[PDB]
Every structure is written in structure tokens, then in C-alpha cells.
Amino acid sequence: GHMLDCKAVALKWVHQFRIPGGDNCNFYCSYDSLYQQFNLWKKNDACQGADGFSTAIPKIQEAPCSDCPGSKTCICSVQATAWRVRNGKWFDGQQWFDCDVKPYTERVLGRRWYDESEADKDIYVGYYSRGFISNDNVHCGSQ
């Protein structure tokens, strides 16, 4: 058979923090440090299908913070796509797993998930996750 009821999930790991206004965000974050964060993501969740994860893309954003005493806001992130993720609830043989994007993202990235409807500027925890469906009704298998 084929399971045609998997989804692709766009995932993003985020560290938002403030730095002295005289500094730059690329004194604090590197492509390499963010790629190492991607390497810590759990790649064998019960909800994971075949084909693993896309190439990770590090990003570094910087803006002066109007509300801060002379600080800049840094947003250091790494994003990748989980190609094939189960839909619904999944029983692994011993217990149930919720494969909805929120619980799945929190298990795989290990940080609190926020809907894309919530902007970075309105999020006040330092470390957090994004996850949203980028493709539905994909094969669970690599064939």
C-alpha cells in the first residue's frame, strides 16, 4: 500500500535576544552555531515519515530596539522542512502521539511553538519554535 495522508512541515528554531547597541548580532551568532542547533533537532519522532529534513538555512536579523536603553534586537534562526510527517494521532505500539504541528514542533525542536500569526516583536521568551504545514497529502514513505 501507500499512506497518502502525511504533510510537509516548515520548522524554524529561534533565539531572540538584546545586545549592546555598539555591537553587531554576527558577534553572537554564526551559520555554524545555528547549523549545530539544527543537528540537535530530534529526527526520529514517532510522527516522522521517510526522507528526513531539507538542508538547514541559518539566518541572522538585527534592528535597533526603540523600547530598549540603546540595545539592538538579534533574531538568530535556523529553518528546514520535515518532508513527511504523519497526520492526526499516531499509536507507536505502546502510546499515542499528537502529530499536529504544535506538539510535533515542540517535541522535535524542544522549544515552545508560536503560530506565525504572532510576530517576533510580540514574543518575549528568548528561545522558541515555528512550525506550519507547507504541503498536505504527501506519501509517508519515500515511494
Which residues does the annotation place in the binding site? 15, 139, 143
Indicate the SS3 state at residue 123. Answer: coil
DSSP annotation of 47: T
Site for Zn ion in 20-39 (CB under 5 A): 29
Site for Zn ion in 104-123 (CB under 5 A): none
6 interacts with Zn ion by CB under 5 A: no
The Cα–Cα gap between 138 and 135 comes to: 7
For Zn ion (CB under 5 A), the number of binding residues is 9
Per-residue contact string for residues 72-101; x = within reach of Zn ion by CB under 5 A: ----x-------------------------
Kindly provide the residue ranges of all beta strands, DSSP E only, lying in 2-142, ordered along the sequence.
6-20, 57-64, 71-86, 89-91, 96-98, 127-138
Residues that bind Zn ion (CB under 5 A): 2-3, 15, 29, 76, 139-141, 143
